[PDB]
């Protein structure tokens, strides 16, 4: 079932560099896995910002939680979660 998840990314202004390589790499794989499995249904970029707007499809809140906590970006993320329900006036799937 569906959640609207806004993420905003706050990489430490100075430092890491360039462990920034290891972290950005686990993040892109981790997000590819999650998208391949349908967990991470949709992924877009907020135009002009370092952050995404996503729709997750998971079985429960606890699942959504562990998935987000697992993200390599987590300690650097600001996350808003928002439960999505079916709309009567919908037509196809989703």
């Amino acid at each position: 079932m569906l959640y609207l998840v806004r993420m905003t990314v706050n990489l430490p202004r100075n430092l890491d560099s360039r462990e920034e390589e290891r972290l950005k790499a686990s993040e892109k794989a981790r997000s590819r896995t999650l998208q391949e499995q349908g967990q991470w249904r949709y992924l877009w970029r907020t135009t002009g910002k370092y952050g995404n707007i996503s729709v997750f499809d998971v079985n429960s809140h606890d699942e959504l939680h562990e998935i987000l906590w697992s993200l390599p970006f987590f300690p650097y993320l600001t996350i808003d979660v928002e439960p999505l329900s079916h709309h009567p006036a919908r037509v196809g799937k989703d």
Copy 2:
């Protein structure tokens, strides 16, 4: 191109089930075309979170303005860009 659109519904107190109907055809046309790409309900609220997939701001503007609920809608629009981590599509 994609827009994340939010529509909060307030209807006037002294005011109908034709509108829900009217809007539902408009919604269906648009969805059959694919420019009202996704329609969701915000759990607990009257109204949708929608993605729209149109060619111009002017297309989206007139399309949003065609909705019969429009005089009663609170609308926020956010542009959506392709993410480099994306796999599925869009």
Copy 3:
């Protein structure tokens, strides 16, 4: 699974009549049922306010959505829904 739900009541101005007492009652009985059956798990009044703050225990967002929409007070409410998850350091129920 768990949602924290805030409900702020805004009952109509120069309207209602004897029907208000009927709406209050409709609402009070829908809520009793919902608590007996367990889906309206916890219910508290916000000190100094007309509304409630609640914990719901339902199977999906869709069930929650249908429950809130069924509430007679629904057209006069502002509603905030937040997903709750099992906390690693819990020692009791929930």
Copy 4:
């Protein structure tokens, strides 16, 4: 009596050594006790955030305040306190 308390954790990032291990365990132990003793009544994870929504059951504002001030995590917490009241529609115990 009853309080709704939201807490958000902003721990120092690249700062902590195995001191980090000392505070987290220190916090789990204090929270376990407060839950065993009854004053930390409910404790939930805010889905996708380093945080909790909690309900504390204590006998004064000062007892709440002393309990919160005493949490190992306190210096890095953002805390919101909300008094809760009995809702006439409540079935069973608040």
Copy 5:
């Protein structure tokens, strides 16, 4: 114990009659009794505003909330409740 309470008044605009006069005078008498007995400890005007900042001294939240609910102006009030605690640097009485 102590609460800081903010109240904002929004009476029906041109909608009342001999009713407004009764409503005002019943509120005035309610607040007087409450101050005379001491649960309504301090009461101030927010300068330039149709509002008050108050300190209530009551023994529970439920008691505060029944006090505020019983106010004739209650339906037309905007109310903020803040629990207050003892400051370790206080000279004399809270």
Copy 6:
């Protein structure tokens, strides 16, 4: 004349030493003097938070400024000042 002052404390993220204990006592010492003299009329603690909510009884905006300015904690405070006025429905003094 009366002012509602909230002060939120945000000490250096250590960035502090045994100057810190020297500081907290300077503040304690100054707050003590001002309550004794009477311009710091009421002092309370925001439940769950590091700071205070207070009523100051001074003769001018200017004198309140100099008092707030002179607080040891000053450069670490976020302050709100709100003028309180005499409420017509006031029975006792304040």
Copy 7:
């Protein structure tokens, strides 16, 4: 002593009819009076708004208050009041 006072005017949407002239008339008369005597020290219009930004020069919060309350426009005004102190870096008068 000095106050920055913002006033936002909001006259009944439809309504008012013929008295809208008398209200504005008395309003103009009252502000004229307060400026002459010097408690209404400065009066400026926020460009593009129906509403003013002013400085008042009065002896107390109560007197500020009695003045704002007596404006014909009061019931329709949203008001922010901010105490103003002499700036040590001032050269001239105020």
Copy 8:
């Protein structure tokens, strides 16, 4: 198509030195190119602020996104993006 974009600038206060002057030059040459091509249609300074308010004319969100991202200043920017539509009443070209 048109977007109204707000950028606020936040350069790390230290330490930079000469490489700040190089940063500012690249930004300024990149902004010139963008304006000569037409993508950066209007640029104005927010009076009193290290910032700009701008109108972009690009073919798509993704084109807007890529231009904002390529800015030398981007890592120090706060950006608000607003899509702009044609107003029926317009007389000019835009």
Copy 9:
């Protein structure tokens, strides 16, 4: 000189009549004049909204104010006015 002026339109819900008729027409008439005379330099519609984001080019605040104060829609408008300055990075025209 330049101002960024936002306008949000809020017509009364149970009103107008032939009143909506005259109003819009004279609104168009007035914006024609202001655009062709150049004081209303740019006029856009915010995508998905009723009202407009504009740039005014006038010679004083008093001029801007009499202009907006004169719009037929003024009693129904919410207006944000913000000064625009010349950005040193500009190439062609302000």
Copy 10:
């Protein structure tokens, strides 16, 4: 023509030693100049804040921008600029 300017000061928590005393003195002298020349028309301290509410009287947005830009405190200031217009009910100066 006139502007209402809010300024709030956030000096580096510490990078200053008595270099800070230089900067305060420099800010003071620059402020002395602008006030003498009559551009900084009014200057008040916001009670309890390190800040000011000022009125600026300058021929253009560009003149005001350059002025605020030139203040020694600028990279530490947060500034609100608001245009001020002639008020019809005004009597004496401004």
